[PDB]
Amino acid sequence: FSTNRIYTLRLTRQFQFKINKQTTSVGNLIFNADYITFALDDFLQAVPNPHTLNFEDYRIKLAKMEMRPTGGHYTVQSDGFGHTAVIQDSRITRFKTTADQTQDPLAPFDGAKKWFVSRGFKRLLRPKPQITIEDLTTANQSAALWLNSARTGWIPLQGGPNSAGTKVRHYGIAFSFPQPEQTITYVTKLTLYVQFRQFAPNNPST
Amino acid sequence: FSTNRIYTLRLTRQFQFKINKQTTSVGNLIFNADYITFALDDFLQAVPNPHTLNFEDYRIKLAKMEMRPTGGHYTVQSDGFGHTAVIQDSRITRFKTTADQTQDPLAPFDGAKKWFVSRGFKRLLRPKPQITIEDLTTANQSAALWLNSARTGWIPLQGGPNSAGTKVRHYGIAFSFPQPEQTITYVTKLTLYVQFRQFAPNNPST
Amino acid sequence: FSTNRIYTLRLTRQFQFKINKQTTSVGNLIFNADYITFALDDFLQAVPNPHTLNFEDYRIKLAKMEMRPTGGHYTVQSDGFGHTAVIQDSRITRFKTTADQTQDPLAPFDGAKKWFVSRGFKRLLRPKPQITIEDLTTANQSAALWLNSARTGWIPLQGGPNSAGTKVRHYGIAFSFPQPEQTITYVTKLTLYVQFRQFAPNNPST
Amino acid sequence: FSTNRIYTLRLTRQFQFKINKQTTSVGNLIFNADYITFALDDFLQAVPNPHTLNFEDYRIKLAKMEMRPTGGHYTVQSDGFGHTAVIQDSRITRFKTTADQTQDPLAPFDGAKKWFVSRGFKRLLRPKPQITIEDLTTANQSAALWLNSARTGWIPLQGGPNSAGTKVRHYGIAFSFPQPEQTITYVTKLTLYVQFRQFAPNNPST
Amino acid sequence: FSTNRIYTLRLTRQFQFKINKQTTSVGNLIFNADYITFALDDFLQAVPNPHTLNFEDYRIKLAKMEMRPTGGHYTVQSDGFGHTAVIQDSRITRFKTTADQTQDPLAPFDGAKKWFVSRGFKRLLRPKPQITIEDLTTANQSAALWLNSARTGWIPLQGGPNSAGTKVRHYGIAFSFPQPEQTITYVTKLTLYVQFRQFAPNNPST
């Protein structure tokens, strides 16, 4: 029971996702995309999970996204295929498309993987937190760097001036789809595999 | 970082394809066919791809065509089977049929593979560029020759009197189908596996 | 062609540098110094280079500075010797001297290497990006940290709140010189050896 | 003494090259470039060489370019450095620059090699003839392909409708330079290492 | 971290040296000479160096003298050769000549190494501090002794009645030259390789 004692937990949450009936450029093949990021706090705030944890540090070793259709949609009713892509930096925010795309916006990525609209998909990834760099050739701008291995660093749950360690955004997975003729609803389940370091007391009473 | 340094990229593009409801020779079995060819420029002009590449030469090692039904078509709704065939010369243009065929026009080909209309198909091939021969027994006519191995040659991206190296047409895959009782729409994804030779600057400023 | 697929490119740019005739403390030995830093954007904006790259992340493995005399300067015309030094943090900005130095301001550095003014120099180094630390004993001040191995991290090209990943400043090489009796002009060539991670599409259309 | 009997010859020619005094943008670093291509006829027409050869076919295994200063220019008078690049397709014609370049136009090439203006350079290469492709996605345009190995093909000296086999253009080497303060004249020597197949008679008398 | 803990540093300083145009005994060969000694304080006083060191003892293991021409002097311009000699006692003071020598005053020394006036020289040596002997056959006179190995002793930085440990003079290197037809200026760089013993606090406050 040393300072560096480690514990591993599995954490999950779910939510609904909708792909809307195509009402634009009807008759043409169009694509759109959305994305998911992972933060420990997103999971601790889910109703059935522990809302606080008594550990000093954490690191996310692995994340999982599974999206499967519901609402009575037929798995044998083909609606083409889109792609999933692992995008481990804040550029992923551009891949929630705000206009219709004439090509699959994710297919060109290295690591892009096909998925069929009518079956959903399942994918695991190593999501990355973004370390700050403030020394750029343009003054007062900043950029990011992330570490190749999760074993390199630890994130204090209550470190920093806001005690907001659990809100670090880890990137990330995006998914694209050809727009279908009818609306399709899905159940999405996210899973975190998180290591925690150092069991810790509550903050002192004041 | 020598003159002969090689890089390899994967490139993709997508489009919609329709097989129309049978409205001719109704009640009888008929077949039609279409085809696809591959040019690097086709892929670089696709919206999400780089539209120019800073390499001196290229060669297409492998191509992949995948066509899958969309528009709510049921995979368990059987509409017979047609064939794909690898046709590596410009004769393939005759296999976009302009009249109904009473037999499957591609089935006799060596290499012809069956595919079910309601499931689509996936096929990889080695598409071939066509070298010119102008010395024929008939005057003012030319013919073609293609090389067995992609490693034999290189196509300069900006070589030739038109600087149109990326537009060389590589042949090719055709697909046939028995005409269905209802229209079927598909999503088609093409993929190229391309080697590039010699990282290169932009053309000099003028 | 996985998420972690790596590509390696060599990139270069050039510019002119002048060491001015000595017009101060005439007859005495004085020294001055200047310095160079490395940012990917510096090289992509150079006219003959690709101005955007379709990769998700990068890291600079190695940099090279070569400065050689031009303008008819005689290599056999001895004008003494100064030093180069590898300075891998923003302290290097103090070594663009604004006053004449009575000693060589770089010679004391560990790693300082001699170079003859009339011949120029060539030096390779591992330039370092600067990670931010904001938790200091003095309020409202920040400091830097850099990683020993380039393999530890990745810089996303479009990551961070400014999408300015390519503008991260990597430090750095400084060079000093005894002031010569006549002006000397040089041609400087910088070279980067950069690994890129994950071929990527263009940003979606908006 | 069979049909496939081979003979190897070394062939050479020389000419003068001038790099002009900079008279534009004086005070700025600018670059220009030129290039050389290789054709057997260029060498057979040189005064001291045999103007016809009694062989049926040939192939160029190796070419060499050596350019060295003359006109009294001092090798110890430094005028910076440019680069040489092997460019084995007709794109090389763009690298005879018609406007001043702000960067070295050849340095980014894979295989680019530095050379000092005041010493000249020497470089060997495998120059390539350009095979015609007329089947492009744009009608009535053509492009090129070249073969990786010289051992793959033979060029008949008198083949084709013009009996102009010796005029096939083999590409190619380009060289760039920073513009110097005074004009520099050079002697350039080119060398071909050519294999010939099948000793042959003169054409019949008519 | 014991009493005997050793640290090793490299220290350097520079200065100008002139060999004057021959204005005496013109038309004849004459020689003059000068010398350098080494004291830690000489290097700590130099502007860019730390002016105090927090160590208890030191010893100089190795010294280096490098003198190279400047002022535009041509290296290919022959001005004869002189010699360097390692003179490890205070007799060296006699070898700053005050009258012209008709022979090279240092060439006879065992260890004398020639150097060309137009190229300068570089020499390493083990400089020696001088231990006092006061028991001589003549009253009120003293002499010197020095130790063969640097490992034999240690010099406390603040030892002795003047706390002037860093001012111990270590001998020494002399250089001779034939008097040239025109003045020649040089840049001289001296380097010390110093071991320090026992990291130490500041002197107590008073």
UniProtKB/TrEMBL annotation, chains A, B, C, D, E:
GO terms for molecular function: DNA binding. GO terms for biological process: endocytosis involved in viral entry into host cell; viral capsid assembly; viral penetration into host nucleus; virion attachment to host cell. GO terms for cellular component: host cell; host cell nucleus; T=1 icosahedral viral capsid. Signal peptide: none annotated. It comes from the Viruses. Transmembrane segments: none annotated. Coiled coil: none annotated. Keywords: Capsid protein, DNA-binding, Host nucleus, Host-virus interaction, T=1 icosahedral capsid protein, Viral attachment to host cell, Viral penetration into host cytoplasm, Viral penetration into host nucleus, Virion, Virus endocytosis by host, Virus entry into host cell. It is found in: Host nucleus; Virion. Homomultimer. Assembles in the nucleus, presumably in an immature form, then migrates to the cytoplasm once assembled as mature virion. Interacts with Rep; this interaction relocates Rep into the nucleus. Belongs to the circoviridae capsid protein family. This is Capsid protein. It comes from Beak and feather disease virus (BFDV). The chain holds residues 42 to 247 of 247 of the full protein.
